[model samples]
Target: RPTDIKCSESYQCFPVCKSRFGKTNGRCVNGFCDCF
Candidate 1:
């Protein structure tokens, strides 16, 4: 399933997945999304 980004949550800033310096799809939890 695709991951949806969420704030107020602990996550790493991925700079090689989404656009080049744009809002990320969201952070990965155990390589998974929270609600997506």
Candidate 2:
């Protein structure tokens, strides 16, 4: 689901990409969230 998500900023991505997904890292790359 993280790969399917997009965000305008890290703050927007961090919540879903990291918090919701239980990931250690979350980055906003070209308006998308790449979480790992």
Candidate 3:
């Protein structure tokens, strides 16, 4: 859960989430990065 990182942007956090979780579905929503 990117809620731990508390992302404030979309595309910005998407890349981080991808490398962290190694998935293609990373989205920043509501100040959080969702892997799903």
Candidate 4:
């Protein structure tokens, strides 16, 4: 189930997403963002 993305607005989800999915700002889902 897709949910709202919980991340710092000032911070970019790119780096974190990269490590998680080799990309940037993955789709938000399941009460948490899926970095893929």
Candidate 5:
């Protein structure tokens, strides 16, 4: 769910999404953290 994710800063999502979903990288889209 894209709406289920949230982040204050774009950079903030990197570490969070990385650990949450074990993604190599993360991006901020519409104020949400997207793991990819």
Candidate 6:
């Protein structure tokens, strides 16, 4: 699952995709959260 939002930094997006969505393989790119 992905959210329609903007991420200014990678640090801010890390926990959200890692913890909440259980997507440990992820990163912030192009102002968005890229989750794997």
TM-score per model over all chains: 0.21, 0.64, 0.63, 0.37, 0.70, 0.63
Question: Which digits, one per residue and each the tens of the lDDT, describe model 4 over residues 1-36?
Answer: 223557543134546676755764555444355564
Of 2 and 3, the candidate ranking higher by lDDT: 2
Question: In terms of TM-score, which candidate is stronger, 2 or 6?
Answer: 2
Q: How many residue pairs clash in each candidate?
A: 1, 0, 0, 0, 0, 0
Tell me the tens digit of each residue's lDDT in model 6 across 2-29: 4654688877877787787888765667
- In candidate 5, what are the lDDT values of residues 1-36, reduced to their tens digit? 354577777788888877887877777888898777
lDDT of 2 by residue, 1-36 (tens): 347687788777777765777987787887788887
Error of 6 at 6 (Å): 1.3
lDDT tens readout by residue for model 3, 1-36? 556667767787778867887767777778778875
Off by over 4 Å in 4: 1-5, 24-36
Give the winner by lDDT: 1 or 4.
Answer: 4
Which residue pairs collide, candidate 5?
Answer: none
- Candidate 4 residue-wise lDDT at 27: 53
Q: CA lDDT of each candidate?
A: 0.44, 0.75, 0.73, 0.51, 0.76, 0.73
Give candidate 3 regions above 4 Å deviation: none
Candidate 6 stretches greater than 4 Å from native: 1-3
Q: Which residue pairs overlap in candidate 1's backbone?
A: 5-26
Q: Which stretches of candidate 2 lie over 4 Å from their true place?
A: none
Can you tell me which runs of candidate 5 are displaced by over 4 Å?
Answer: 1-3
Model 6, residue pairs in steric clash: none
Worst 10 residues of 1 by lDDT: 7-16
